[PDB]
């Protein structure tokens, strides 16, 4: 019997506190499981207004005409900045989409995306970093950095792997 699906709008599995996130289920009232405990709720999509770190963990959905969904892992981080990607492992030629997300979407300027300690891309005003086709040269440790008004802020590093 078909297993329901969990999709996230927007697509980011790693968010900052006070981000919004909608988790929609794809099956068939529905039942939601956060950390294997039913919550509750039972609307089609479950909505988080302002994420906290307790909101982290495993989510699953399920509907009367479907089985218990495969789990999705949502991560809530604390900081001024967060490097977001739809995933962290890429084949060659695949497109790379990186987002430098600022807390509460605070205006961020003089942004750079850094690979292995060396700034790779600079924008005057925060923008997404796109690598249309992935090379082996693109693997490594990435983070982003910028100015919040006059304060120099930085995100934690995330590992990017280009297989193969």
């Amino acid at each position: 019997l078909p297993k329901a699906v969990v999709f996230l709008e927007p697509q980011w599995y790693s968010v900052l506190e006070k981000d919004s996130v909608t988790l929609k289920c794809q099956g068939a009232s529905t039942q939601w499981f956060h950390n294997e405990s039913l919550i509750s709720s039972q609307a089609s999509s479950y909505f988080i207004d302002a994420a906290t770190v307790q909101d982290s963990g495993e989510y699953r959905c399920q509907t009367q005409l479907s089985t218990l969904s495969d789990p999705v892992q949502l991560e809530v981080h604390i900081g001024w900045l967060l490097l977001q990607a739809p995933r962290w492992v890429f084949k060659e030629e695949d497109p790379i989409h990186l987002r430098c997300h600022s807390w509460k979407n605070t205006a961020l300027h003089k942004v750079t995306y850094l690979q292995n300690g060396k700034d790779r891309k600079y924008f005057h005003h925060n923008s997404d970093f796109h690598i249309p086709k992935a090379t082996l040269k693109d693997s490594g440790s990435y983070f982003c950095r910028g100015l919040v008004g006059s304060k120099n802020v930085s995100s934690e590093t995330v590992q990017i792997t280009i297989t193969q």
């Binding site: 900052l16 900081g79 001024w80 605070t106």
Partner: protein
């Protein structure tokens, strides 16, 4: 318009305050750019990771740029500071995503004992009505040092000391200039340069200078 929320600055004791038991050395944590909308600041203080509760926080003050500034002062033990304990000010506020932590400790590196030399005025300056007494203090590390002057054992006032200057071997040097009326130099009053630094025995030396 304070996009980044409040900033924190953490200041060490004055060198003389840590070198003399009669004085009280203090670590000073200054939070600036506090908005009127969320003016509540919380201070946590840590010594080598262990929280302490004997800090003294004064309540806020509006600034000229119409923001609040708030100061917390923690007195430290001389031996603690000098043995390299770490002092951590944690500042919590709603306008920040997380609380700001700042840490200070005495400058690292192997202490080097300052050498103190007094230098009398040039001949060429003996034609003016004030003359310059010089104190060269070289070969010390770290650069935290304090320098004073006395005449016949009483403190002198009109003196100026250059900042420490990094020398070619990694130690520091500086000079201190005491300006005296030529009458007082030629009369034979005994002037002295006094240096306080952690690498000196008893944290204190004094060199004398007389016509020369």
């Amino acid at each position: 318009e304070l996009l980044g929320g409040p900033s924190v600055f953490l200041f060490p004791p004055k060198p003389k305050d840590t070198l003399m038991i009669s004085r009280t050395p203090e670590v000073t944590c200054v939070v600036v750019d506090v908005s009127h909308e969320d003016p509540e600041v919380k201070f946590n203080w840590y010594v080598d990771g262990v929280e302490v509760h004997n800090a003294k926080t004064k309540p806020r003050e509006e600034q000229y740029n119409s923001t609040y500034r708030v100061v917390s002062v923690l007195t430290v033990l001389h031996q603690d500071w000098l043995n390299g304990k770490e002092y951590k000010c944690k500042v919590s506020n709603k306008a920040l995503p997380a609380p700001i932590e700042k840490t200070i400790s005495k400058a690292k590196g192997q202490p080097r004992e300052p050498q103190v030399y007094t230098l009398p005025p040039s001949r060429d300056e003996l034609t003016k009505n004030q003359v310059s007494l010089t104190c060269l203090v070289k070969g010390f590390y770290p650069s935290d040092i304090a320098v004073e002057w006395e005449s016949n054992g009483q403190p002198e006032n009109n003196y100026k000391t250059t900042p420490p200057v990094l020398d070619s071997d990694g130690s520091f040097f500086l000079y201190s200039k005491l300006t005296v009326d030529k009458s007082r130099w030629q009369q034979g009053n005994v002037f002295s340069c006094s240096v306080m630094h952690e690498a000196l025995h008893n944290h204190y030396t004094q060199k004398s200078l007389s016509l020369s």
